[PDB]
Amino acid sequence: ESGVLRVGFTASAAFNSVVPGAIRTFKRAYPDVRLQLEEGNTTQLADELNEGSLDVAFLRPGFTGNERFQLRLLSEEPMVIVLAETHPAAACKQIALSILKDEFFLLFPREIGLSLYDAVIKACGKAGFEPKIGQLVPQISSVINLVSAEMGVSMVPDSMRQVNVKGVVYRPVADQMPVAKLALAYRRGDTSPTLRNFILKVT
């Protein structure tokens, strides 16, 4: 219809084409709706849904509260490896996650950064080891730039390939099939026509 709609997403989720593609499709079909967009991590985006300062969110499932919200599983992209071009393993078409047992891992801060981190370590432990914590920077951008500086490595969703930083390469892992999970989140009982049309343009 027409009105306001507060849409949230994680910075890493925004690269996933389904996030700007849904905002594009909704902006075109309902150009009178006042869109108000927000960026934030999974837990903070959930607190806004609870309090009411947000209507729908592109977040990662598994957070503590997925029962009291309506969760629409969206897509599953694979997790690739960020490698410095100077690294000798960059020549490999596919990397065994086992090969990076002796490298530092630049990941999200262990605290509010609860998304993806837990997915890296779970896929990483399956290769039979636990990554030593390298540098902890709260943004994917700086994670990828810090790999360019030869400060370590990391695992990122395949949608991170759009960050074409000179000096880094993106290679999938052949040992396993790690994936990044995304979900559409909104409260269980919402009657907003402006919101309703959004889940319909997403799905």
Next chain:
Amino acid sequence: VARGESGVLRVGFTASAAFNSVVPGAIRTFKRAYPDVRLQLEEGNTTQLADELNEGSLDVAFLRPGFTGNERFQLRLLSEEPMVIVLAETHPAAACKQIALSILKDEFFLLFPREIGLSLYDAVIKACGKAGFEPKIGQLVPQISSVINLVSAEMGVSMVPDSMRQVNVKGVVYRPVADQMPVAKLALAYRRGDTSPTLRNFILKVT
């Protein structure tokens, strides 16, 4: 032994600054040539990084000059860099190789909170200010990366450093500004009189 071969150096940099090739390049060079120093890297906006320099929780920073209180620190001006226009592929102005800023006087602009960004925000307003308008503030997001993803959603336009060409997001292109010459300055800030050897060797690898 205490000649900078070993020890701890804390380096700071802003989000946008990291994309510039000087920041990563300097770090690897220092790392390569001084493996045994514990590098403690961290991100922050220029205001936060400078305060960390003054308070002693940070040894050197890659920040943007001009911030208030910068005369208290030693600033080595790094290489300047032009500011390009970001816009969706579907934008009709994307067909041009160079864009005039007066073209987008009513176009919604996708900027960032002035608190998270002082200089780049100032450069944007000052550029459009010379173009003869104040930018229609559309949405505000915290990381720059996110304005490029939001510009992919046709939610407006924005102006970012030329380093962000590396953000090759499907649906956005970058075209330089033709009617003016916006720029994005970068400096290396440290304490005037910090004689930490590890710090001094680091300045050598930057300049």
